[PDB]
Amino acid sequence: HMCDAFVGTWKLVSSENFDDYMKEVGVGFATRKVAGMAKPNMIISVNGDVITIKSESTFKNTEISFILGQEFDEVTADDRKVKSTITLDGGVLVHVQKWDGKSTTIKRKREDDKLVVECVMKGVTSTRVYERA
Numbered sequence: 749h750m751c752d753a754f755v756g757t758w759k760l761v762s763s764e765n766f767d768d769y770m771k772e773v774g775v776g777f778a779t780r781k782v783a784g785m786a787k788p789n790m791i792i793s794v795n796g797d798v799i800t801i802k803s804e805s806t807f808k809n810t811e812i813s814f815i816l817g818q819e820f821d822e823v824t825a826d827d828r829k830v831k832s833t834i835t836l837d838g839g840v841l842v843h844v845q846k847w848d849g850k851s852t853t854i855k856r857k858r859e860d861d862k863l864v865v866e867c868v869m870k871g872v873t874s875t876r877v878y879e880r881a
């Protein structure tokens with residue numbers, strides 16, 4: 749029952765500062781423009797120890813399955829090939845991505861009826877708010 753409150757089908761409703769986060773990560777102009785339009789649906793499920801997050805949109809579909817604390821290979825929506833480790837810290841999913849000698853952290857939190865995704869690269873944060881679909 750570890751991630752119960754995350755499970756479901758979620759739709760992006762709002763974003764703040766996402767262009768600057770993508771700049772900080774190194775995303776090029778064309779991908780920033782088309783990625784910034786997308787309103788993905790994120791489908792989170794759990795089966796035993798395995799968590800799956802599937803995202804579907806216009807622009808790109810992505811899918812990760814993982815065990816908490818166990819590093820895995822990920823392909824991001826901007827097409828980075830990263831090494832990722834996801835843990836639970838005080839009821840927040842904490843996701844670190846390493847690639848090309850860089851690092852970024854994505855936190856996923858339940859806040860009221862919303863799922864809040866906070867993305868940090870060095871000094872720059874972006875907040876992406878999802879609602880139940």
Ligand SMILES: COc1cccc(CCCC2=C(O)[C@@H](CCc3ccccc3)OC2=O)c1
Nearest residue numbers: 770773775783786788803805808810825826
């Ligand atoms: C640095 O450039 C980026 C460009 C696009 C997305 C991200 C990740 C943002 C954080 C994040 C979500 O909102 C979900 C869903 C991501 C998603 C967006 C669009 C289409 C399919 C899936 O998964 C997460 O990793 C970074």
